[PDB]
Symmetry: C3
Subunit: 281 residues, 3 copies
């Protein structure tokens, strides 16, 4: 069974400078509140061990999302691209845009493209100056992405901003209605507003959902499964959010879920492959 | 079992002019995404066939809900009155309004009254000028309907407006708070905000819920059924939203639902008969 | 096995003046609508009968939340204090604040503490001038409470204000994020926004939930129980909202809920004991 993890941050090179690795104290309370044990690979910061766990889980590849902050938290687009160039058979790079002016944003897009990266990630709720995903300032970016067939990963669930308004489902819904041909992946699946986001995905045929860590024993779990077994078969994406969840435990739990066999295949790898193939252009 | 369907738009007269019938390609996509096959009578645009399916489903009467929408189609109130008077044993007419100003709204309300029609439907999120149901401009209309004991159907679930803010339960809650003696039916049951609408109904004793098609295999199903088995027994309405759902298949599915038998009877006919009594004044 | 009821308004003293006892007919709609019969001690307003029902239910103590409303009636802080000192093995007093001005609040907080009360309750949605719990004007109050280790109870669930925006989880989520070491108990558990408030409790470690009456056969019931059995075992508080619910029927139902024993004892008494220890300093 082929598995592609849509949120997987390796303990490798520039990623060891991220908060998920420099502050394991914070990451571990989160992993533990979810009901899991910290992966040994993440505890030890061992890429070697991570590869072993990937293998034992059945995960062939990963989608590596950074943070292009330029601050201490950062893992630059250059560094995500170095990781992918070092294990090209294992990690797909995603470029993140983190920008004050629209000129900076397009200078960063220029660099992302030149690095051979083709999927962009936006997390505007965690920027130095936070904004909502439907902020007027982000609209030139979406127009560019839509006109160029570029898929956009946007953080609209979990701790997507300084407070819960940053996951309110009105913000992504505005964006999808105003860019009806733009491919959007909501990372964390817009959790916890699951009732609402199922309706959004129902209405907005371009929206993919990746609940990741938040599918595990939390509100909305039933709703996601129910939708995966109907209209959302082709628009849901397996993901662990590793290192937040351990690879082996999470994947082997996901594999027992009451999802119909052809939808399982799409959620595990087919939907991702389709996304990646669209990006490649 | 007597059964009154609270949302039916038969393939007759003006109703054939609405996008529900003029774009069956769009409608049938929605019907199949929900998990149904299109009604043959709707495919054929045939009243004969519609009556036969109604009889085969065990549905005695239908509430013919007007629509006036500059995008979605317009069916005149004169036609809604004419369909009902041609089949007075089968059909209860509901008039609709599309207005940009309060006087435009009151003139249309008066036309509707003059035609013999005693209930009004409002779908302001799909008007020429889209508005929230708690728009200031609707308030003098609500005061009139409250003062005269006129029940009001309002669309505040599903695709009620350009984006998901037009289903946010804050809008219908304000109305009920400002017009505490007004009978309101929420068409589509304010879906997807299903945890919240049950609270609105708990608090506001004159709110009725008719989730219709959005009951089927979607989030909130369990919440609706639980309330139906409790305080909402008196205030939920069976409706199919035909031609979005086939009469026969929807009704048979509905009749297998775990809803206590005394509640099932009120929901299938008792609750609507009390509403139609009230509109009888 | 010891039960501490986190919300119990006994039929004595000043409490006899609240709208929960002066309007039995409103109360009783909420009670029967939930599915209970009114407690015989509430009907008669007999304290001695309440003590009988309390012991029959197994409840050892109750937290007496005073109301300082012009919308829901009044029991002054002196009265709450008098109930507790007349029944010191049975009642824990909670002080409430209703004020326009910062200086008015600070003087009420001074009297609360002079009366020997160590917990404060805030229900600003029901003041003569309703405000949200994150209104700028409450921030000085929260700052004092956080610096002084005083636990704050705030009503952010149920009929918390004029309309459902007064329970939107964005409001308590701001207060918890701006006062990360303030102990907050959400009375009514911010129902109906149960998917949302679970994420909020997940994210904000100082939040305690007390859904009380709203845990009964209503949406979010399973979201609450699921979190009680995991990360919220230490942060959930049993309570009946007596006289809104009968003590014996509610407690018997509650005791049979699928909650593991170590989590069950915390929710029944251990968490409330910890809060009371905190308030005792």
């Amino acid at each position: 069974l082929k598995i592609i993890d849509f949120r997987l941050r390796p303990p490798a090179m520039g990623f060891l400078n991220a908060r998920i690795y420099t502050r394991p104290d914070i990451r571990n309370r989160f992993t533990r509140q979810l009901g899991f044990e910290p992966a040994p690979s993440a505890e030890e910061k061992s890429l070697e061990l991570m590869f072993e766990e990937m293998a034992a889980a059945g995960i062939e590849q990963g989608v590596c999302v950074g943070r292009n902050s330029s601050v201490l938290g950062s893992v630059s687009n250059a560094d995500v691209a170095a990781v992918a160039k070092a294990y090209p058979d294992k990690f797909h790079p995603v470029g993140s845009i983190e920008a004050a002016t629209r000129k900076e944003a397009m200078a960063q897009m220029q660099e992302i493209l030149d690095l051979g990266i083709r999927i962009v990630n936006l997390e505007p709720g965690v920027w130095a100056t936070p904004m909502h995903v439907d902020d007027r300032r982000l609209y030139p970016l979406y127009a560019f992405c839509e006109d160029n067939g570029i898929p956009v990963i946007m953080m609209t669930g979990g701790n997507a901003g300084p407070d819960i308004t940053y996951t309110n489902p009105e913000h992504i819904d505005r964006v999808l209605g105003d860019f009806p041909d733009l491919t959007v992946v909501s990372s964390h699946g817009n959790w916890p507003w699951v009732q609402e986001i199922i309706h959004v995905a129902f209405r907005r045929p371009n929206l993919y959902l990746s609940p990741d860590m938040y599918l595990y024993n939390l509100p909305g779990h039933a709703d996601f499964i129910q939708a995966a077994n109907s209209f959302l078969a082709d628009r849901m994406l397996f993901g662990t959010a590793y290192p937040m969840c351990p690879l082996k435990e999470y994947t082997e739990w996901f594999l027992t879920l009451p999802i119909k066999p052809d939808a399982m295949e799409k959620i595990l790898h087919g939907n991702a492959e389709r996304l990646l193939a669209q990006a490649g252009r």
